[PDB]
Design a protein around this nucleic acid. Structure first.
Ligand SMILES: NC(=O)c1ccc[n+]([C@@H]2O[C@H](COP(=O)([O-])OP(=O)(O)OC[C@H]3O[C@@H](n4cnc5c(N)ncnc54)[C@H](O)[C@@H]3O)[C@@H](O)[C@H]2O)c1
Ligand SMILES: [K+]
Ligand SMILES: [K+]
Ligand SMILES: [K+]
Ligand SMILES: [Mg+2]
Ligand SMILES: [Mg+2]
Ligand SMILES: [Mg+2]
Ligand SMILES: [Mg+2]
Ligand SMILES: [Mg+2]
Ligand SMILES: [Mg+2]
Ligand SMILES: [Mg+2]
Ligand SMILES: [Mg+2]
Ligand SMILES: [Mg+2]
Ligand SMILES: [Mg+2]
Ligand SMILES: [Mg+2]
Ligand SMILES: [Mg+2]
Ligand SMILES: [Mg+2]
Ligand SMILES: [Mg+2]
Ligand SMILES: [Mg+2]
Ligand SMILES: [Mg+2]
Ligand SMILES: [Mg+2]
Ligand SMILES: [Mg+2]
Lengths: 51, 58, 71, 171, 110
RNA sequence: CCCCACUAUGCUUAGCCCUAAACCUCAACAGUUAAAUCAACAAAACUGCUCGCCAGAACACUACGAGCCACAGCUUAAAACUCAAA
RNA sequence: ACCACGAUCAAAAGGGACAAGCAUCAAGCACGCAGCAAUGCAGCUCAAAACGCUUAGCCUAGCCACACCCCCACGGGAAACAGCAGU
C-alpha cells in the first residue's frame, strides 16, 4: 500500500513537471526568437562591412 | 541506520531524486524536486520508516 | 627584528663547511665504503627474491647492475 | 593545413568573391595572412566535421576542438623553438586542460565523446593510480621480479609433464 | 535467499575491467569520525562477476551477493547497471540526459 | 679596508647543477566594511571554503637512511647529553 | 534416558569487523581472474598507508594465549612447581 502510494506521488509530481516544462519552452522560444533577430542584424551589418 | 549504505551523486541528472534498494530486490524511487528537506524526511519516514509502535516495542 | 637567529645559523654553517673541507679526504674514503656495502645490500635483496621463489641461480641471462657507481 | 589559396573566414561568405581579380583573391587568402588566420580555418573544418551545431561555440565539444587547434599550434612552435620554456608550459597545461574536458565529456555524453576522439584523433588514457618516482633500485628490482616469475612459470609447466608422464607409465 | 556473504546489496563505481568476466568495484560508505562527529567516506573494493563483460570503467553498478563465493575475492555478481558512464537515463522521466540537461525533452512523448 | 696588474668568472653554443632575506617574510578562491575596530609594531578588521605547514630553547640548513647527471653537493631530516628559559 | 528432522550449547570451514608507535619501513614480488578440464588472460595489494620494524596480554560478570625449550612435538635438546606450601 505504501509502495503504490509512492508511485502515485511520483505521477502527481510528473504532471507538475510537464506543466512546468511547457511554460519554460514558451519562454525559451521567445528568447530564442529575439537572439536570432539580433544575431541576424549583427551578421548583416558585419556582412555589409566586409562587402 | 549505521548498516545502510548511503552514497551521494552530484549533477548526474536534471532533477534530484532518492532511490532505495530493498533486500527483496525491489527499488523505490522518490522524486524530491520542489520539496523541502523536512517534507523529504516526512515522506521517507512514511513509506520506509518504522512506526512509533514498532520502536516502542523494541 | 635583529639578526641574532641568523647569526647563530651563520656560524653553524661556517664551521660545518670548514670541517668538511678539513676532512674531505677521510669523508671520501668513508663514502666509497658506504656505496660498496650499499651495492652488496642491493645484491642480497635480489638474491633473496629468486631463492625464496624456488630458483637455485639467478634467472638465465640476468646480471645485477652497479646502480650506485659514478659511471 | 588548408591550401594557401583558401579565403579568410571573414571573406568566404561575401557575395561575388569568386568573380574578383586574382590579385584580390590573393590579398584575401591565407597566403597573405598570419598563422592565426589559418588556425581559424582549421577550427571551422573540425566543427562541421564533428559537432552537431557548428554555430554553438560554448559547448564542451567546441571547446575541446578549439583547444586542440591551440595544442597543435604549440607543438609546431616548439618543433622550431625547443628551448622556449614558456610555450612548453603552455603546451603541457593545454594538454592537461583538454584531458579534463574529455573526462567531463566522457562522463556526460559518451556518444559525443566517441565522435570527438575519432574526429580529432585523440587516444583517451586513464591517469595512473599512484605518483611516485621509479628510481634505479626500484626499476632494477621490478625487472628482476618479473624475470623470476617468468622462470617459475616455466618450471611449474615442466613439473606437469613429468608428473603426467610417470602417471601414464603405471597404466 | 540465505548467503554466507556479508554484504548482500551494495552500490559502487567500476574502477577496473582488466580481469576476465570480473569487474572491480569501489564501494563507499559513510563512517562517523568519533572525535569530530563528522561523516567521512570509507571506500572498499569488491570483485563482481560480470558474465557478459558489459561493465565500463566509471559506471555505477548494483552488486548482489552470491550464495557462496565463486573465487577467493569474487563474492558478488553484477545485478544491474544503475548509471552507464556518459549514457545516463533519468529515472524520474525516463529520458536520456547529459549531466543536468536533457538530450530528449520530456515533452517529446508528452 | 685604499692603489695597480691580471686570471677563473660575467658573454655565445651544448649539457648539467636545482640553491636565495627565491621576502611584497602576508597561501588559493569567494565575500564584507556592521557589529566587539584592534595585545604591540607592521601594510585596518573580518567571514566562508580548501590545500600546505606549526606545537619551549639549543643540539640542527646536523647524524643516519633514501633519492638525485649532483662526489667538499642538493632534497628529506632525527635522537642522546643540556638549560628554565629562549 | 532412547529417536528428537526440534531446541540448547558450540568446533572446524566461509563472509565481515577488530591495539599502539615509526613513512628516515614506499613500494610488495605472484601477492589475480576465467575455464568441467586442458589451458588461457596478466593480473592482485598499496600514501584512504600495502609491505615492514618496534611495543604491548585484551574491549575485565570475563576473554585470549601459553603450559621447560625447538611457533607445532613424530622426533630432538633434555629431565621441567607459570597447582598449593616452601627454597
Ligand atoms: N601517493 C599518491 O600517488 C596518491 C594517490 C592518490 C591520492 N593521493 C592524495 O595525495 C595527497 C597527498 O598524499 P600523501 O600525503 O600521502 O603524499 P606525500 O606528500 O606524503 O607524498 C607521498 C607520495 O605521494 C606523492 N604525492 C604527493 N602529493 C600528491 C598529490 N597531491 N597527488 C598525488 N600524489 C601526490 C609524492 O610524489 C610521493 O610519491 C592526499 O590527499 C592523497 O589522498 C596521493
Ligand atoms: K627557500
Ligand atoms: K624582502
Ligand atoms: K610455545
Ligand atoms: Mg634596525
Ligand atoms: Mg653553533
Ligand atoms: Mg677572462
Ligand atoms: Mg650580448
Ligand atoms: Mg626577488
Ligand atoms: Mg595553494
Ligand atoms: Mg624545538
Ligand atoms: Mg642551505
Ligand atoms: Mg645535509
Ligand atoms: Mg648521507
Ligand atoms: Mg570458528
Ligand atoms: Mg608523506
Ligand atoms: Mg634515520
Ligand atoms: Mg600493518
Ligand atoms: Mg610481553
Ligand atoms: Mg618453571
Ligand atoms: Mg610447546
Ligand atoms: Mg608456588
Amino acid at each position: 500500500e505504501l509502495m503504490a502510494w509512492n508511485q502515485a506521488e511520483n505521477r502527481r509530481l510528473h504532471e507538475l513537471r510537464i506543466a512546468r516544462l511547457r511554460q519554460e519552452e514558451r519562454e525559451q522560444e521567445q528568447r530564442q526568437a529575439l537572439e536570432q533577430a539580433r544575431k541576424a542584424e549583427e551578421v548583416q551589418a558585419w556582412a555589409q562591412r566586409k562587402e | 541506520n549505521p548498516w545502510v549504505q548511503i552514497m551521494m551523486f552530484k549533477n548526474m541528472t536534471p532533477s534530484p531524486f532518492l532511490r532505495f534498494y530493498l533486500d527483496s530486490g525491489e527499488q523505490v524511487l522518490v522524486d524530491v524536486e520542489t520539496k523541502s528537506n523536512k517534507e523529504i524526511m516526512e515522506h521517507i519516514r512514511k513509506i520506509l520508516g518504522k512506526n512509533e509502535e514498532t520502536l516502542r516495542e523494541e | 627584528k635583529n639578526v641574532l637567529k641568523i647569526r647563530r645559523r651563520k656560524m653553524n654553517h661556517h664551521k660545518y663547511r670548514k670541517l668538511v673541507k678539513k676532512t674531505r679526504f677521510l669523508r671520501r674514503k668513508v663514502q666509497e665504503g658506504r656505496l660498496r656495502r650499499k651495492q652488496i645490500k642491493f645484491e642480497k635483496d635480489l638474491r633473496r627474491i629468486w631463492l625464496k621463489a624456488g630458483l637455485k641461480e639467478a634467472p638465465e641471462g640476468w646480471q645485477t647492475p652497479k646502480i650506485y657507481l659514478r659511471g | 593545413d588548408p591550401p594557401p589559396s583558401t579565403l579568410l573566414k571573414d571573406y568566404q561568405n561575401v557575395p561575388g568573391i569568386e568573380k574578383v581579380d586574382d590579385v584580390v583573391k590573393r590579398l584575401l587568402s591565407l597566403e597573405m595572412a598570419n598563422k592565426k588566420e589559418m588556425l581559424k580555418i582549421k577550427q571551422e573544418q573540425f566543427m562541421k566535421k564533428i559537432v552537431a551545431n557548428p554555430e554553438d561555440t560554448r559547448s564542451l565539444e567546441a571547446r575541446i576542438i578549439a583547444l586542440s587547434v591551440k595544442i597543435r599550434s604549440y607543438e609546431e612552435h616548439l618543433e622550431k623553438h625547443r628551448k622556449d620554456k614558456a610555450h612548453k608550459r603552455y603546451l603541457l597545461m593545454s594538454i592537461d586542460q583538454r584531458k579534463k574536458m574529455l573526462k567531463n565529456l566522457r562522463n556526460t555524453n559518451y556518444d559525443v565523446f566517441e565522435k570527438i576522439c575519432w574526429g580529432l584523433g585523440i587516444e583517451y588514457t586513464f591517469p595512473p593510480l599512484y605518483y611516485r618516482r621509479a628510481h634505479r633500485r626500484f626499476v632494477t628490482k621490478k625487472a628482476l621480479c618479473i624475470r623470476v616469475f617468468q622462470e617459475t612459470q616455466k618450471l611449474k609447466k615442466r613439473r606437469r609433464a613429468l608428473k603426467a608422464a610417470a602417471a601414464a607409465q603405471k597404466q | 535467499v540465505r548467503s554466507s556473504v556479508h554484504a548482500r546489496w551494495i552500490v559502487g563505481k567500476v574502477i577496473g575491467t582488466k580481469m576476465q568476466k570480473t569487474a572491480k568495484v569501489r564501494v563507499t560508505r559513510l563512517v562517523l569520525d568519533p572525535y569530530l562527529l563528522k561523516y567521512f567516506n570509507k571506500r572498499k573494493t569488491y570483485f563482481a562477476h560480470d558474465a557478459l563483460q558489459q561493465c565500463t570503467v566509471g559506471d555505477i553498478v548494483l552488486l548482489r551477493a552470491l550464495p557462496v563465493p565463486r573465487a577467493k575475492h569474487v563474492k558478488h555478481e553484477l545485478a544491474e547497471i544503475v548509471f552507464k558512464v556518459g549514457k545516463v537515463i533519468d529515472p524520474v522521466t525516463g529520458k536520456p540526459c547529459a549531466g543536468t540537461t536533457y538530450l530528449e525533452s520530456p515533452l517529446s512523448s508528452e
